[PDB]
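Box 3.1 A note on notation
Throughout this textbook, protein chains are presented in two layers. The first layer is the amino acid sequence; the second is a token string describing backbone geometry. Keep the layers aligned when reading.
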Amino acid sequence: MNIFEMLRIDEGLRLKIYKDTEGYYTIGIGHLLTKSPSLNAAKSELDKAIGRNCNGVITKDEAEKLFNQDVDAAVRGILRNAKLKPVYDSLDAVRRCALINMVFQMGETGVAGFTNSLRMLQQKRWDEAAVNLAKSRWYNQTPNRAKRVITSFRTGTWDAYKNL
């Protein structure tokens, strides 16, 4: 298992514009298009992102390209972030994947706000961190995905995904 397979399980693949769990316009593998209510604004962002008139629809290939960009940008963002970088550097491979997953879903800023949990991860207090991460809107809103990520941080194995 790798970061790509992990995120592909959590986000799915949709080739037509869709609304995410939060009601936002998305396409492909969790690629947020806009937080704006206008499907029109979404179709415009999409065309800008792909470089063609897509009419709200993309190919598998296009979805995967966007995905490659997003994962890359998620990693670069962590590495550039003063709060995130030190945590990432302290982690093992699997747990690094878990942090990338959170950043891909909620953006750098959102994850950097998990001050206490970040501190516990840095200290390698697995059980305490899992408990703290669960006390969040994130967990209450998308509990099955959050549990999967949390288990990854808790155990340092891919057990939560070997099911799936």
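The first strand starts at residue 14 and ends at 19. The two ends are 11 Å apart (CA to CA).
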